[PDB]
Symmetry: C6
Subunit: 70 residues, 6 copies
């Protein structure tokens, strides 16, 4: 089969369940918060404020607890 898209479902499940995540940027910096919303190119990450994070600056998104899409 087509091989199913895994970036938008994964992020959406984190967003919907308000899972706390750590976002590591390419320069080593670690952001934390909850995924508020996201778009093809950015992610809105909410902690004390909403900050807009470019996907092209992200290395990894690692959730506090396991999340499943199917």
């Amino acid at each position: 089969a087509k091989g199913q898209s895994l970036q938008d479902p994964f992020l959406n499940a984190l967003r919907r369940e308000r899972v706390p995540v750590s976002i590591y940027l390419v320069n080593g910096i670690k952001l934390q918060g909850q995924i508020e919303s996201f778009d093809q190119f950015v992610i809105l990450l909410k902690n004390t404020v909403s900050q807009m994070v470019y996907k092209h600056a992200i290395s990894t998104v690692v959730p506090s607890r396991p999340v499943s899409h199917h």
Copy 2:
């Protein structure tokens, strides 16, 4: 679904002071004067063009009003 643009227009319109962190760790500050698919014009003492491909994060001083 576009929110980069709704999120960046709102900061511009409201003249919200922002911090822009670059991929190399540098922190820029100012107000978003105007901003496009490939750059953002950031105004402090002078207007300086900033390439979006060099930005990691845009973080506003004061929360901006979104849905």
Copy 3:
């Protein structure tokens, strides 16, 4: 349109080969490839973490793998 990237990654995933993923900033991740898409890889160790391919330099499998018996 053609790729050896998808064929190579899928074999690692299917066989549950332990891999090391080196990022562009020098950081080394390890785990098994759980799934992947055009733009990311899900890497499983203690938890599943999502790794952007544009942050990866190399994927190096822990144990060598088959040619796929290519003709």
Copy 4:
């Protein structure tokens, strides 16, 4: 504000008015000179010599004076 509206008009105004600029690269290096000409993908920067700077390596272009321009 839609499409590439600010990417090339701003550069042209610098180029035409021979405004001295500073170009900061993504690795922290600071170049200075006058924009001589620009492609979609590069900028020619003139000081003692003309050097070709890839845009993908640039973080910011900051002019010496706010352009004596519409803005």
Copy 5:
């Protein structure tokens, strides 16, 4: 002569075919070495002790040990 533009794939294919030992320098300064086993639009498979997959977007230069004739 005449041509289609690309020399990136002919150059790589010649190295692969001739089993030329190469050095691949990554954008972070790391030096990889081996032989080019195969490659696609986006990656190169580099063989030493094991076959590892190298993203082209991480590569700065490919420099062959000895002459390649295109």
Copy 6:
């Protein structure tokens, strides 16, 4: 309506066999002559030909002045 100078500039350097320095994004300086080049790569000749990805280059600077 604009112009393309990236591929005229290179191609003048390659034709005139001008010495050049290519600075990479990581600070490394390569030197040589442009031999062949492409949408995404430049072939740089010194003791051997090496293939340099454009996406790794910050600047190309000629030893001697030339026209765009």
